[PDB]
C-alpha cells in the first residue's frame, strides 16, 4: 500500500474542483520513494518506502532513532 514507512502518510481523498466548481472525486498520493538508508551502528543498508518529507524527518532525527520508533510500533524495516 502507498504508505510512508516513517510518517505514515496514507493517500487522502478530496475533490478536483473545476472553474465552474464541478467537484469530481480525486485522490492525493503521498510522494513515496524507495531509498537505501545507511545505518551506522549495524553497518548495513536499509531500504525503506519513504515520502520526501519522511526523508527530512530521518534527516533531523537520528536515522537509527527513527528506526527505533518503527520497531516500537512493530513493523520490520
Amino acid at each position: 500500500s502507498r504508505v510512508c514507512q516513517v510518517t505514515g502518510k496514507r493517500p487522502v481523498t478530496g475533490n478536483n474542483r473545476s472553474h465552474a466548481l464541478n467537484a469530481t472525486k480525486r485522490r492525493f498520493l503521498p510522494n513515496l520513494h524507495s531509498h537505501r538508508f545507511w545505518v551506522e551502528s549495524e553497518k548495513r543498508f536499509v531500504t525503506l518506502r519513504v515520502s520526501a518529507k519522511g526523508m527530512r524527518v530521518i534527516d533531523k532525527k537520528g536515522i537509527d532513532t527513527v528506526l527505533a520508533e518503527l520497531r516500537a510500533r512493530g513493523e520490520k524495516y
Partner: protein
Amino acid sequence: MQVILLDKVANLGSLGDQVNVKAGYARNFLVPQGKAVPATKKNIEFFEARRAELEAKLAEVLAAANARAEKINALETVTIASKAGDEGKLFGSIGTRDIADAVTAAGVEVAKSEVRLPNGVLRTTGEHEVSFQVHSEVFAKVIVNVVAE
C-alpha cells in the same frame, strides 16, 4: 545541510568545518562513507573535545602508510601472462580485477576498486601505464606487461 566534516574533501573540505552543502551530497556520499557527519549538538560536543584532538590525525596516520603502499612493488613493472591472437587484439577483453588478482600475487596487496585505467579497458597489447588509488591526489603509475602467450 550544515554538515561538519571529518576528512579533507578536495574542494571545500578542511577537516572539521561546518559548511553548507546540498541535501543529496551529504545523505548519499559523505555520510555512508565516513567522510563527514550531519552536525548535531551531541557529535559536535564529541568533535571539539574527542575527535578534533588526535582522532583528526588518526585518519591521517594510515594516510602516510598508504603513501608507502604507493610503492610496495619497487620494480613498478608487473609481468602477467595472457593469451592473444596475431597482430595484438588479445583473446578476451580483460577487466580491472585481472590486475587485482595478478598484482597481489606478485607484490602489492591491492583490491579491484582502487586501480584506475585511463586507457579504456586495455584492448591494446604491450606495456601500458595503469594507475592506482591509494589517496585522493597521491598516485602510483605501475606499467603492467601483457604479452601474448
